[PDB]
């Protein structure tokens, strides 16, 4: 029973991993756009900080 | 006129189970209608969304198709 | 209104804290009622085992026995021994009651149906159990009864054993779930309950359950024959009611823990139709 | 604890059946692992059906 | 007036303390066995909500069940004084009541009422299990009624003063 | 940057990934690095802007897609962002977006059960061996 | 299994601190009002680690 | 072993199996739990309702 | 025709009302917890740690944008309170 | 079912019971197989983990082997005087054999519809992956 | 040991005034190892922006689900030598404890 | 005995395909592990690192994209 | 809802605990401690090792 | 582990205990406590306790606590490998088995020396 139950749990884990492959694929499809938005916001904040630093230190 | 003991015991079991089962299935008692209304409000509209210019079907045509098919009931 | 609104920013939030307090009070009252019903169930089950009616006249057919005993425990007067430390004698049961009524936070009633989003449920359970054992030991020490002090030492020994026993059980369990959260066990137990893997150590699981619940054969701290009453030999009224409530709270919540981690939790026993079931459905 | 002939025969048959049961269980576990391998192969084929494009790393990475 | 609230709360308190009536696990002589017989299934005590507690601190009733000796009288007095209030005392058996078979002895106290205030007496030697059950139930009824035995007088408005 | 919420952005991206593929490839190539540590966004700003403009263009949908988009939104709300559990509804939305003309016949060939309100409650219906990942 | 005699017994030597009661033993009044005791036994028990060492029973609580 | 503290000259694997069954799989919590809790609870209660019924007496 | 219950079942049924009361109280407690955690979110939100890294990022992106990005990008020297009762850093140091 | 369909999380979120849709999807795939039955080139490239003959033999043999094992077990350890427990254990062994055989058959079906996924048209692939048969209207006569 | 709680009758004032107060004063005056760490509220929180940055590519490439990853990478991959040393140390310590008991 | 059995089975699993060989003998660890383990490892010599897919060039199926 | 079945199981286990308390005797602290630290710790560790070996075999 | 909700719940639990405090105080109205000689003295089964506050016990099982201190840490060291056993490799597997074997050998040595049982002193 111990051996068979461990085998069954490994089967469940591997099925979960099989579905995780497709979930990762969907996440990859969605990744570039969110990354672009995050980068644009990050660069906007960096530009504001650069302007402030230049004005204060010049 | 008499009834079987198991029939009476099943009656008692049903008396316990039907109310408990219903209460468990509907934890938000009497607010299920409010939940439905909130879901309807969350559902977006054509004005809320932005549509393509070269739409195959216009908004009126889509509404008529949905009415004909009885999409939501 | 423009110049008056700032004055009420912090004043309009107090009702929210009051609502939070009210909800917590309701939850605590409901769990107290559950534990009272558990005590009545215990008396009735022991009555069945011993072939006796049990509580039958406190309320029609003994429906309000737990209410009666709780009210009586409230009513009973209390006196602190002169030789005992007045501050600690009352401080210890207060802390024990606070810890016992904090127990219920570490409970799950669904995939994510928990009052708080706690991840280390097992860590919380271990810490709370250690705190309650601390309270029991301090109770025995500050009540200078020799029997109470021996009960506290027995509680210490029980805690020492529980450490390793429950730690090893948790180590074996986390090896599958890979988390301390109760939810992660049920997803694996959907097909087969985790008790099947541990069927060989089912006796040890039963031992762990009884030892953590402080039930026989592990009722050493409260042994009523070896010791007069145990750690509560000099406590009466609601001071002793608090210890009883804490013991029953621990019993109920560790029963829940065992059910979730080894018996599928909220999953029906689908293993009874395993042979007839199909593992996939492809159209 | 002397044993009679019938009890000894029962004990011997119990031991033999236990050995056979253990061997059969191990064989079935081996078969179950092989089945898991087959399922993994099938699902890999299904997933890779449409994921056939490999993009080389840009030359500027180095 | 407070009576409006006190009287219903008095009734609730009496009901609760009647329903939960825990005696002390203390037996001295053959009367102990009769107490055990009442506790056991044939005449279940639990039906009437009486459960025995080992420590006096958690006891409501003092069952003086058995003979009391001069060598033990101080112990009985100490136990009675250490039992948390409110409490009642039930003497069981001839020996506990008035010295019983050993009233003419040099060691036995001629009655537990000399050392303790006895609320109720249950005659017998030994009292039957049903006799002890009757005594306990009568004590419970008297206990329930003790809260308000019509002491305070009613004024023209029927409110006690 | 979009004035759009996260889950709706994911739903839209599941379709936009096929319309702005060249922009996505350009952005990916620009951000490629020899180590897992991310590259400075200042170098990829231009590709990111191009990708976002194409995403703005793609976010538009035909009105016939509104029901599919709403049910996908409801699914992604009841499930806390689990794309796999709601891929069927997202897949329907992608199908409606691609060649919306055929979605009329798609809806016409609908059963009585499918022509019903879609309510999601994952606590009541966990599913089969859901790892939530 | 190895020997444990030295761990199992502790004798007392004349005027020796190590071979002596280095602890204040627990002198408990087992009974008379004790659930285990039948009710009229006043046993003075000398416990040392919850192990009985010395018994002084008083049984006159039921002399009649 | 029945007659005294001594042990048999030649121990057999039957003792090994018995000890393994007793220790690895503690049968108390199952054997006794079933036999008492589940079975003895099926007997009618022996209680006599004193207020409304009286126990047997003799002249 | 005495169609009475079997003796074992009749004996067992004595303790049933206690089970019914326990179920009433337990359902009350569970429903109260469910409603308390359901009303604020309008759903039973999955635990944050029961989610993938990408899912966590997508879930918390909107909260980060509404709470930190907008104040950061609309910051002015005179917006900060002089009492130093400002919002704490997202990663407190 | 233990795992449900491998393509999607079955009964996740909303539970859908559409026997009409299931029948339409089954009919569509049956028509597809029938239409491409004659194509020898297509039949050549069909692959499966376990042969159809092997899975059929296992399906029809596992319950028999289980019943034989149960018969041996009852003969060796069960008292012939009684019959209730002997029948119960024999049926349990037969059900275990049937479980093994049914698992063989179901895994063959899983392999058939997974390894050959690339051979289906786009509409049939979508219909298989999703629970809806609306992707393959043409195949089920509409 | 020390069940009653009675402790040595000790007066800390003498040593406090003779050695400890002045030595502590000197140590506090001349002791600061923190080089340039800055308190919160040193600058407005609106100037800090990195915490908002998110790496979605790394997020979808990351499969970890527990916070024990650094601990395992340390005890079982990198610092496994010290892990084994700790194990041997605990074994030898158990032996030493047994010998001290004897 | 269990250790010996599993080790023997692991060494016998070489018959199976590469992905199904024993993980005792073959390593399958996250990208964070593998990068640091094989960064400048000439013994393995995996090659350049795919940033957006978190794998080396020579690892099987490193960059797997749709369509 | 899941808590319905969970409450059923909790009640079952509470009844099991109550029945066990009514059936079984009480251990000694020294006896149980010796049993634990001499037998049950080894049993737990051996079971853990067996689980590790089986997981390695299946993975 | 939680958030500030846990501290607020601790405060709420204290407020809840105030309710039981109020009930206990109100119960004072339904009984009177007389002053008696032995009413507020230590209970020793119906007789005066000879000793109070000199209640020293014998800690002759201290080796069990000594070994618990070590074995708690030994078990704690195993958590990361158990959590991430899906990432196990040859080195990690060898180290885990090595550590478990060390624990077993320490337990075996303790059993051999017979320090897991009560002693005379
Ligand atoms: C302004 C709003 C207005 C709204 C509309 C108006 C109001 C509508 C309210 C409707 C509900 C009110 C309550 C109805 C109770 C009916 C009781 C009855 O039938 O009388 C007989 C019954 C006789 O009991 P008894 O005299 O003690 O038994 C005699 C002997 O013991 C001999 O025993 P026996 O042979 O008689 O067998 C006993 C048992 C035999 O039956 C069974 O055995 C089956 C039940 C036990 C299952 C056990 C499962 C676990 C198994 C464990 C293992 C096996 C067991 C053995 C183990 C040990 C083995 C050794 O049979 C029963 O008693 C069944 C009665 C079930 C009543 C509970 C129904 C609700 C429960 C779920 C919660 C509902 C929440 C509200 C939902 C609202 C929406 C619908 O009357 C009672 O005394 C009640 C006993 C049960 C406790 C009920 C406590 C209720 C407390 C108040 C709740 C208020 C909140 C909910 C309502 C809120 C408003 C909606
Ligand atoms: C006499 C002279 C006159 C005196 C007058 C005194 C003053 C009167 C009031 C004056 C002021 C009025 C102002 C009105 C306007 C402003 C209103 C406002 O601000 O709210 C807006 C505010 C937000 O506006 P919204 O978003 O539009 O609201 C829509 C919903 O929130 C949307 O909901 P959702 O869809 O999100 O679903 C979630 C919702 C849905 O959940 C529900 O509320 C539905 C019901 C849940 C289950 C309840 C089960 C109760 C029974 C369990 C079993 C108990 C057994 C033990 C006790 C014995 C029972 C016989 O639940 C929640 O949101 C969490 C609330 C949890 C409430 C706590 C549990 C309630 C029971 C407490 C029991 C206490 C212990 C027992 C005491 C026993 C005493 C003998 O609304 C709320 O937050 C609603 C809170 C409702 C709380 C529950 C109220 C009672 C419900 C009926 C059950 C009553 C049971 C009584 C038992 C008695 C036994 C003797
Ligand atoms: C996926 C994982 C699954 C789990 C894995 C677990 C693995 C564990 C492995 C390690 C352990 C292995 C153990 C092996 C054991 C066998 C070893 C062996 O072969 O040794 C030979 C050994 C030597 O025996 P022998 O010397 O040959 O003598 C034969 C015996 O004298 C016997 O003489 P006999 O044969 O003439 O009489 C015995 C017979 C007597 O049988 C009968 O009388 C017929 C049944 C009477 C039922 C009575 C209750 C009816 C209730 C109706 C209620 C209606 C209510 C209506 C109103 C409702 C209102 C709501 O009893 C039975 O055989 C009962 C079997 C039928 C049970 C009921 C059907 C269950 C179906 C389960 C689903 C299956 C679906 C397929 C897929 C399954 C997938 C797992 O055999 C035995 O010792 C036999 C022992 C039989 C004991 C039967 C106990 C039955 C259960 C009693 C429950 C009582 C409950 C009371 C109430 C409690 C309330 C709290
Ligand atoms: C946390 C609580 C505990 C959980 C434990 C895990 C579940 C284990 C379930 C039982 C599996 C079998 C274990 C071994 C049993 C060995 C019994 C035995 O000794 O038989 C011979 C015994 C006696 O034979 P013996 O030879 O061993 O001893 C007798 C000695 N002579 C011969 C001299 C007389 O015979 C029996 O009566 C056995 C009856 C066993 C019935 C067990 C019922 C258990 C019911 C409660 C289990 C928990 C249910 C939880 C449900 C939860 C649902 C959500
Ligand atoms: C809460 C406690 C519950 C305890 C219940 C105790 C009740 C009393 C005992 C009833 C036993 C009834 C007989 C069958 C029990 C289930 C056996 C099992 O695990 O098979 C599932 C397994 C199912 O495994 P599977 O999941 O691989 O099934 C096929 C899987 N697919 C679909 C993917 C192909 O059954 C079999 O496959 C047949 C046996 C295969 C060989 C290996 C079996 C190892 C375990 C055997 C234990 C046998 C114990 C009983 C011995 C005989 C007693 C008469
Ligand atoms: C009227 C006089 C008042 C006198 C002063 C009052 C003194 C109160 C002393 C106790 C409370 C201290 C509160 C301040 C510290 C808060 C720490 C913190 O940040 O945690 C939240 C943090 C929340 O952090 P986070 O992870 O949510 O991140 C927050 C993110 N930002 C910054 C954006 C908001 O908690 C945690 O992260 C983990 C949960 C910890 C739960 C701890 C539970 C046990 C607590 C026991 C306290 C017992 C106190 C009483 C007894 C002991 C004697 C004091
Ligand atoms: C969210 C749900 C909330 C539910 C809360 C439910 C809890 C209800 C608690 C009720 C407590 C009642 C206490 C009664 C005290 C008076 C009686 C008494 O003790 O008698 C002994 C003594 C009097 O003893 P006596 O000498 O008169 O003797 C009485 C005996 N006979 C009759 C024989 C003479 O009490 C007094 O001293 C009385 C006078 C002073 C007290 C006056 C009342 C003060 C009320 C304070 C209320 C505080 C509310 C706080 C709210 C906020 C809490 C966070
Ligand atoms: C973890 C809880 C669940 C249990 C899981 C582990 C089960 C281990 C036993 C599996 C079956 C072994 C079958 C052996 C058949 C055989 O050779 O059998 C040969 C003989 C047969 O004797 P009989 O003639 O009496 O049948 O038996 C033996 O030699 C007994 C071997 C010991 C078995 C004791 C129980 C296992 C204890 C743990 C293993 C360590 C054993 C050390 C012995 C010195
Ligand atoms: S009254 Fe009679 S029965 Fe009771 S103790 Fe005295 S002699 Fe014994």
């Amino acid at each position: 029973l111990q051996m068979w139950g461990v085998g069954k749990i490994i089967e469940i884990k591997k099925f979960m991993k099989r579905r995780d492959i497709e979930l990762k694929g969907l996440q990859r499809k969605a990744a570039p756009f969110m990354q672009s938005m995050n980068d644009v916001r990050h660069l906007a904040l960096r530009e504001r900080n650069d302007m402030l630093y230049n004005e204060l230190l010049s | 006129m008499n009834l079987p003991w198991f029939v009476r015991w099943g009656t008692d079991v049903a008396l316990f189970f039907i109310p408990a089962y219903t209460f468990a299935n509907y934890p938000t008692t009497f607010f299920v209608f409010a939940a439905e209304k909130r879901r309807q409000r969350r559902r977006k509209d054509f004005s809320d969304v932005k549509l393509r210019d070269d739409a195959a079907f216009s908004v009126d045509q889509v509404k008529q198709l949905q009415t004909k098919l009885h999409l939501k009931q | 209104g423009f110049w008056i609104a700032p004055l009420f920013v912090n004043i309009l939030s107090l009702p929210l804290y009051l609502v939070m307090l009210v909800y917590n009070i309701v939850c605590m009252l409901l769990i107290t009622l559950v534990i009272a019903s558990i005590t009545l169930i215990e008396r009735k089950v022991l009555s069945l085992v011993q072939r006796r009616v049990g509580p039958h006249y406190v309320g029609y057919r003994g429906r309000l026995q737990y209410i009666a005993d709780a009210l009586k425990l409230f009513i009973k007067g209390i006196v602190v021994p002169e030789g005992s430390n007045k501050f600690w004698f009352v401080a210890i049961p207060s802390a024990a009651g606070a810890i016992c009524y904090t127990f219920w936070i570490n409970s799950m009633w669904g995939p994510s149906v928990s009052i708080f989003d706690l991840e280390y449920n097992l860590v919380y359970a271990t810490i709370l159990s250690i705190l309650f054992s601390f309270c029991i030991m301090l109770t025995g020490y500050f009540s200078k009864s020799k029997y109470a002090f021996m009960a506290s030492i027995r509680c210490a020994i029980l805690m020492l054993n529980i450490e390793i026993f429950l730690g090893l059980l948790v180590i074996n369990l986390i090896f599958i779930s890979e988390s301390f959260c109760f939810s992660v066990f049920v997803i694996y137990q959907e097909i087969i309950w985790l008790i099947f893997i541990f069927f060989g150590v089912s006796g040890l699981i039963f031992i762990t359950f009884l030892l953590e619940t402080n039930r026989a054969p592990f009722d050493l701290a409260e042994a009523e024959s070896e010791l007069v009453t145990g750690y509560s030999v000099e406590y009466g009224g609601f001071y002793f009611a608090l210890y009883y409530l804490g013991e029953y709270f621990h019993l109920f919540f560790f029963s829940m823990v065992i059910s979730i981690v080894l018996f599928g939790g909220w999953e029906l026993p689908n293993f009874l139709y395993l042979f007839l079931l199909n593992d996939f459905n492809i159209l | 604890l002397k044993h009679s002939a019938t009890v000894l025969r029962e004990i011997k048959k119990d031991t033999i059946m236990m050995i056979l049961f253990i061997i059969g269980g191990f064989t079935y576990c081996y078969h179950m692992r092989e089945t898991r391998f087959q399922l993994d192969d099938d699902f890999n084929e299904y997933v890779n059906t449409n994921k056939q494009t490999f993009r080389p790393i840009p030359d500027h990475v180095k | 007036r407070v009576d409006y609230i006190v009287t219903p709360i008095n009734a609730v308190v009496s009901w609760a303390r009647q329903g939960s009536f825990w005696p002390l696990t203390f037996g001295l002589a053959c009367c102990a066995v009769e107490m055990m017989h009442a506790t056991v299934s044939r005449y279940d005590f639990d039906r009437f909500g009486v459960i025995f507690r080992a420590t006096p601190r958690q006891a409501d009733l003092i069952l003086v069940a058995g003979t009391l000796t001069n060598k033990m009288a101080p112990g009985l007095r100490r136990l009675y004084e250490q039992t948390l209030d409110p409490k009642w005392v039930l003497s069981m058996g001839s020996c506990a009541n008035g010295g019983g078979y050993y009233h003419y002895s040099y060691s036995v106290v001629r009655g537990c009422n000399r050392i303790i205030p006895v609320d109720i007496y249950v005659p017998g030697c030994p009292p039957t299990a049903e006799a002890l059950m009757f005594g306990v139930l009568q004590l419970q009824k008297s206990l329930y009624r003790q809260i308000n035995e019509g002491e305070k007088k009613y004024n023209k408005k029927d409110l006690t003063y | 940057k979009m004035n759009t919420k996260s889950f709706e952005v994911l739903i839209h991206s599941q379709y936009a990934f096929d319309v702005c593929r060249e922009q996505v490839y350009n952005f990916e190539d620009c951000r490629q690095t020899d180590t897992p540590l991310p590259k400075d966004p200042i170098h990829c700003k231009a590709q990111a802007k191009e990708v976002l403009s194409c995403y703005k263009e793609a976010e538009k949908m035909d009105p016939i897609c509104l029901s599919s988009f709403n049910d996908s939104r409801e699914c992604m709300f009841k499930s806390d962002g689990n794309l796999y559990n709601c891929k069927t509804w997202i897949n329907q939305y992608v199908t409606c977006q691609k060649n919306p003309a055929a979605f009329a016949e798609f809806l016409e060939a609908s059963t009585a059960e499918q022509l019903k309100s879609k309510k999601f409650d994952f606590v009541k219906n966990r599913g089969h061996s859901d790892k939530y990942l | 299994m190895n020997r444990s005699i030295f761990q199992l017994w502790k004798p007392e030597s004349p005027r020796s601190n190590v071979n002596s009661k280095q602890i204040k033993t627990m002198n408990v009044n087992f009974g008379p009002q004790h659930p285990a005791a039948h009710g009229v036994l006043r046993l003075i028990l000398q416990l040392n680690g919850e192990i009985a060492e010395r018994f002084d029973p008083h049984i006159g609580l039921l002399h009649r | 072993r029945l007659y005294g503290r001594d042990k048999p000259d030649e121990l057999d694997f039957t003792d090994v199996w018995e000890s393994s069954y007793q220790n690895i799989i503690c049968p108390e919590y199952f054997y006794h739990f079933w036999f008492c809790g589940i079975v003895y609870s099926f007997e009618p209660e022996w209680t006599i309702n004193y207020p409304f019924e009286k126990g047997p007496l003799s002249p | 025709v005495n169609t009475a219950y079997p003796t074992p079942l009749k004996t067992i049924l004595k303790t049933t009302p206690a089970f019914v009361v326990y179920f009433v109280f337990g359902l009350g407690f569970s429903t109260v917890i469910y409603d308390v955690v359901y009303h604020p979110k309008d759903r039973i939100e999955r635990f944050y740690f029961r989610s993938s890294k990408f899912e966590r990022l997508s879930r918390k992106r909107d909260e980060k944008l509404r709470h930190y990005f907008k104040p950061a990008i609309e910051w002015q020297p005179w917006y900060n309170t002089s009492t130093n009762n400002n919002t704490r850093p997202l990663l407190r140091y | 079912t233990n795992f449900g369909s491998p393509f999607r999380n079955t009964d996740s979120g909303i539970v859908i019971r559409d026997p009409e849709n299931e029948k339409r999807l089954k009919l569509a795939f049956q028509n597809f197989w029938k239409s491409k039955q004659e194509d020898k080139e297509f039949q050549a490239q069909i692959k499966t983990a376990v042969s159809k003959d092997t899975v059929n033999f296992m399906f029809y043999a596992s319950p028999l082997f289980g019943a034989l094992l149960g018969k041996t077990y009852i003969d060796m350890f069960c008292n012939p005087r009684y019959f209730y427990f002997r029948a119960f254990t024999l049926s349990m062994f037969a059900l275990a054999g049937y479980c093994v055989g049914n698992g063989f058959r179901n895994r063959y079906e899983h392999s058939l519809y997974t390894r050959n996924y690339h051979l289906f048209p786009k509409d049939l692939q979508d219909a298989l992956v999703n629970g809806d048969a609306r992707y393959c209207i043409s195949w089920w006569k509409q | 040991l020390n069940i009653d709680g009675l402790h040595l009758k000790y007066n800390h004032n003498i040593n406090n005034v003779l050695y400890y107060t002045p030595s502590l004063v000197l140590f506090l005056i001349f002791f600061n190892i923190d080089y340039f760490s800055e308190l919160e509220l040193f600058l407005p929180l609106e100037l800090s922006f990195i915490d908002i940055y998110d790496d979605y590519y790394e997020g979808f490439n990351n499969s970890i689900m527990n916070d024990f990853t650094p601990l395992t990478l340390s005890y079982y991959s990198i610092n496994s030598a010290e892990f084994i040393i700790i194990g041997l140390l605990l074994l030898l310590g158990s032996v030493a404890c047994v010998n001290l008991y004897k | 005995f269990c250790l010996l059995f599993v080790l023997a089975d692991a060494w016998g699993r070489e018959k199976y395909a590469q992905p199904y060989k024993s993980q005792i003998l073959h390593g399958r660890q996250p990208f964070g592990h593998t990068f640091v383990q094989n960064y400048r490892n000439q013994a393995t010599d995996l090659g350049r690192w795919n940033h957006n897919f978190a794998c080396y060039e020579k690892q099987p199926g490193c960059g797997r994209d749709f369509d | 809802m899941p808590y319905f079945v969970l409450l059923f199981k909790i009640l079952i286990f509470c009844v099991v605990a109550i029945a066990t308390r009514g059936t079984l005797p009480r251990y000694r602290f020294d006896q149980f401690t010796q049993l634990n630290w001499k037998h049950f710790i080894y049993i737990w560790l051996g079971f853990l090792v067996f689980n590790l070996c089986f997981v390695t075999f299946f993975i | 582990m939680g958030d500030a909700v846990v501290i607020h719940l601790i405060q709420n639990v204290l407020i809840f205990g105030i309710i039981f405090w109020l009930l206990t105080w109100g119960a004072e109205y339904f009984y009177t406590v007389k002053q008696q000689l032995t009413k507020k003295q230590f209970y020793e089964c119906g007789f005066k306790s000879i000793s109070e506050l000199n209640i020293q016990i014998n800690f002759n099982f201290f080796m069990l606590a000594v070994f618990l201190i070590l074995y708690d840490v030994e078990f704690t060291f195993l958590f990361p490998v158990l959590f991430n056993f899906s990432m196990f490799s040859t080195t990690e597997l060898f180290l885990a088995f090595f550590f478990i074997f060390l624990i077993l050998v320490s337990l075996l040595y303790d059993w051999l020396n017979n320090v897991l049982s009560w002693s005379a002193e």
Side-chain angles (χ1 to χ4, degrees), chain D residues 7-57:
Chain D
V7 177
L8 291 173
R9 180 179 179 86
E10 297 294 353
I11 293 168
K12 181 181 178 181
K13 103 186 186 185
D14 298 331
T15 303
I16 296 168
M17 294 298 147
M18 177 180 58
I19 288 296
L20 298 180
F21 182 48
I22 295 168
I23 294 173
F26 289 175
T27 302
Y28 184 84
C29 289
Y30 190 101
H31 173 254
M32 180 167 55
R33 187 175 62 183
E34 175 59 19
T35 276
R36 190 191 75 71
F37 295 160
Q38 297 171 11
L39 294 175
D40 283 325
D41 284 323
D42 302 353
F43 192 83
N44 292 334
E45 293 291 351
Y46 153 72
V47 171
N48 300 336
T49 294
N50 273 325
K51 300 181 68 176
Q52 296 291 356
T53 47
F54 304 81
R55 289 190 56 77
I57 302 177

Side-chain angles (χ1 to χ4, degrees), chain H residues 4-21:
Chain H
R5 69 185 191 282
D6 298 321
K7 298 291 177 296
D9 295 0
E10 190 278 339
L11 297 175
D12 192 65
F13 298 99
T14 290
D15 195 332
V16 162
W17 287 107
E18 290 289 4
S19 184
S20 303
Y21 167 73

Side-chain angles (χ1 to χ4, degrees), chain N residues 19-86:
Chain N
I19 300 172
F20 294 153
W21 178 17
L22 279 173
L23 291 173
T24 308
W25 179 40
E28 302 290 357
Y29 189 89
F30 308 104
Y31 61 91
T32 187
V33 187
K34 170 174 283 188
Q35 179 63 23
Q36 289 170 342
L37 180 58
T38 70
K39 186 164 188 60
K40 300 181 177 62
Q41 296 185 354
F42 300 120
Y43 162 81
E44 192 72 359
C45 297
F47 281 96
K48 191 168 181 178
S49 58
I50 67 182
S51 179
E52 76 89 359
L53 187 66
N54 195 9
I55 55 179
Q56 176 178 0
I57 53 125
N58 190 13
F59 192 11
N60 54 16
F61 60 93
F62 63 91
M63 295 304 304
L64 298 169
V66 163
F67 295 139
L68 179 68
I69 294 166
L70 307 179
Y71 299 154
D72 280 358
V73 186
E74 289 182 347
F75 301 155
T76 302
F77 269 105
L78 292 175
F79 276 85
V81 56
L82 299 169
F83 271 73
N84 299 284
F85 195 83
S86 63

Side-chain angles (χ1 to χ4, degrees), chain C residues 117-182:
Chain C
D117 55 1
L118 271 46
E119 183 181 6
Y120 311 149
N121 294 122
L122 301 179
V123 173
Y124 261 56
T126 302
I127 296 167
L128 295 174
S129 303
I130 293 170
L131 293 178
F132 202 79
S133 61
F134 268 114
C135 287
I136 289 173
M137 279 213 312
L138 296 181
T139 311
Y141 171 73
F142 289 113
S143 62
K144 296 296 180 184
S145 180
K146 299 176 181 296
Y147 299 102
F149 200 49
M150 288 185 295
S152 71
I153 300 302
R154 291 185 176 186
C155 167
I157 299 169
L158 286 175
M159 201 290 300
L160 293 174
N161 295 324
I162 286 167
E163 288 294 348
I164 53 170
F165 229 87
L166 226 179
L168 295 174
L169 175 54
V170 168
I171 268 172
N172 290 26
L173 289 173
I174 62 183
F175 178 60
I176 283 67
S177 63
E178 308 178 6
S179 66
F180 290 138
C181 185
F182 296 147

